[PDB]
Design a protein around this nucleic acid. Structure first.
Ligand SMILES: [Ca+2]
Length: 579
DNA sequence: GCGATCAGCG
DNA sequence: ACGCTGATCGCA
């Protein structure tokens, strides 16, 4: 019902300087995934191409990598990475519908063209599930069905750029798309394609150690419990702890006894079995997620893993890492921190460089809340986490153990993000009256922060949404709900999203200024990972001197707040040695 | 499929 | 009864 040409060859009218391009990659993980079809819509008409034909034509390949040939797409990173696995570059992406919908409303959950088209009353295009099917029924259709679906998606992108750019401009989000998210999309594509090398031999050795350590801990659990049970079974573990051993019931989930880590920590004076169960899970978490799971996704010929950086998923504008997740690699426990030793540079005589912001959200909060004392604290380069560990535990700066500091990290972010005296009393294991007094003293030192959190909830109730420093937006319809639980979670989202989202916008602008700077200096250094507030790079060891002077200044100068930004950097032979 | 749990980021 | 994620696993 839509006219298009099924082009056998590549012609000149298909190579206009403005076009809507669709490079379809049906598989979820687009790394090394087959391209099933190509569709182009421009001023001259609508065209469908077969990938074996076009991707071997020199004029079509030159048209893809020509930055002066502007292309409108949906999810340009998916196509760009799949083309990189085919030796083909893709430049000139002037509009990405996927990221344009993500800025307008992040909760819409837009994952295909049809969902984004519905936001603008465009429905002349089928959802991808209706074309390819669900799960075990997933199948690329017959060429006439596939060719029309790809052309209808291209025609939809062709018609939706203008109305999407109009609403972005009213939301003050148009420069957020064109100057931040779309340039970031190209950088993330190179990071995903570059991959991160893994020492498969060392990981395989840890797995054999964890295999025989897990049995020893598992046998002591059976010794202390007096019988065998599925340690991962909540029913039997609940029977062992709160029926057999008759331990106190401190928490009940919707399904039964709660055996979470915070609960088992409080049962430590009562029995020695809860401390080994804790150790068993930690060894089990490392074994399943980071040993077996990591070796599953490694590419054997290159010993590199290729993550997918999801740019249009989080509600605050953060990134996320999938298959594998390289943003929750262990670090706090020494047994699990060794796994970071397996992450190595991709070439000999290369090293890993890693820089990160120091308490970025509290500094963003100081700027936005305009609090006198909080801005003074960071103008002195104070360590609020250590300074809070002194006030809590009555110790001095010398006696602040990294455990007392990480616990003060929770109090600092918890208090500013609406923790109650109940929740504070459970984390500090203090009386509920002391925790309430501590929160009163905390807001006496920072009255402007308390004033800001009241204003940001009142502004959310008025506007219906909250914004970040670069005008990223999150709607909060529940902020006016009649239910107390539903409204309170919305109020704490209004306190947190502008702060966490403004930190995401700063690290994103830093990535863009970093690659433009690395290009100017003509360095072979390139980014590998982003962990929210940390940037990880690899580079030849000779470039390390320049990077120690370049990366900190680039990150510190990404934005200009009423307080300075601080960046700490390290380099070394592995990711482990890079912090 | 989902909830409990836990790894990370603030 | 601070916020934002992804992976694993048992299933009450
Ligand atoms: Ca940090």
């Amino acid at each position: 019902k839509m006219a298009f040409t099924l082009a056998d060859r590549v012609t000149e009218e298909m190579l206009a300087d403005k076009a809507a391009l669709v490079v379809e990659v049906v598989e979820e993980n687009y790394h090394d995934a087959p391209i099933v079809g190509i569709a182009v819509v421009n001023e001259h008409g609508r065209f469908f191409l077969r990938p074996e034909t076009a991707l071997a034509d020199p004029q079509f390949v030159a048209w893809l990598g020509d930055e002066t040939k502007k292309k409108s797409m949906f999810d340009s990173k998916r196509a760009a990475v799949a083309l990189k696995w085919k030796g083909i570059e893709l430049c000139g992406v002037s509009f990405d519908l996927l990221l344009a919908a993500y800025l307008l409303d992040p909760a819409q959950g837009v994952d295909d063209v049809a969902a984004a088209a519905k936001m603008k009353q465009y429905e002349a295009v089928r959802p991808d599930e209706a074309v390819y099917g669900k799960g075990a029924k997933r199948a690329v259709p017959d060429e006439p069905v596939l060719a029309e679906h790809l052309v209808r998606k291209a025609a939809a992108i062709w018609e939706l750029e203008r109305p999407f750019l109009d609403e972005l401009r009213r939301n003050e989000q148009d420069r957020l798309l064109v100057e931040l998210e779309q340039p970031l999309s190209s950088i993330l594509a190179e990071m995903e394609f570059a991959g991160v090398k893994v020492d498969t031999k060392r990981l395989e050795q840890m797995g054999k150690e964890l295999a025989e350590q897990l049995g020893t801990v598992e046998q002591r659990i059976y010794e202390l419990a007096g019988q065998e049970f599925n340690i991962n079974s909540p029913k039997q573990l609940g029977v062992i702890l709160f029926e057999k051993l008759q331990l106190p019931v401190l928490k009940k989930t919707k399904t039964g006894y709660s055996t979470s880590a915070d609960v088992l920590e409080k049962l430590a004076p009562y029995h020695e079995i809860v401390e080994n169960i804790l150790h068993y899970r930690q060894l089990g978490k490392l074994q399943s997620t980071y040993i077996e799971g990591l070796l599953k996704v490694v590419r054997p010929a290159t010993k590199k893993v290729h993550t997918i950086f999801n740019q249009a998923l989080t509600q605050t504008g953060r990134l996320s890492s999938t298959e594998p997740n390289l943003q929750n690699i262990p670090i706090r426990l020494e047994e699990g921190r060794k796994i970071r030793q397996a992450f190595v540079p991709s070439e000999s005589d290369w090293l890993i460089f890693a820089a990160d912001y120091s308490q970025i959200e509290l500094r963003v909060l100081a700027h936005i809340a305009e609090d006198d004392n909080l801005m003074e604290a960071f103008r002195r380069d104070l360590d609020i986490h250590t300074k809070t560990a002194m006030d809590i535990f009555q110790v001095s700066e010398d006696e602040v153990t990294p455990n007392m500091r990480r616990q003060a990290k929770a109090v600092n972010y918890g208090i500013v993000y609406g923790i109650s005296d109940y929740g504070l009393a459970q984390n500090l294991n203090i009386s509920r009256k002391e925790a309430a007094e501590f929160i009163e003293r905390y807001f006496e030192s920072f009255p402007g922060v308390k004033r800001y959190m009241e204003n940001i909830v009142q502004e959310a109730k008025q506007k219906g949404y909250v914004t970040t420093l670069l005008h990223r937006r999150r709607y909060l319809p529940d902020i006016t709900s009649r239910n107390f639980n539903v409204r309170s979670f919305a109020e704490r989202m209004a306190m947190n999203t502008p702060i966490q989202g403004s930190a995401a916008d700063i690290i994103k602008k830093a990535m863009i200024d970093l690659n433009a700077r690395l290009k100017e200096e003509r360095l072979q250094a390139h980014l590998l990972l982003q962990v929210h507030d940390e940037l990880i790079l690899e580079a030849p060891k000779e470039e390390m001197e320049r990077l120690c002077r370049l990366v900190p200044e680039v990150m510190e100068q990404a934005v200009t707040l009423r307080v300075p930004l601080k960046v700490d950097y390290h380099y070394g032979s592995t990711w482990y040695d890079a912090k």
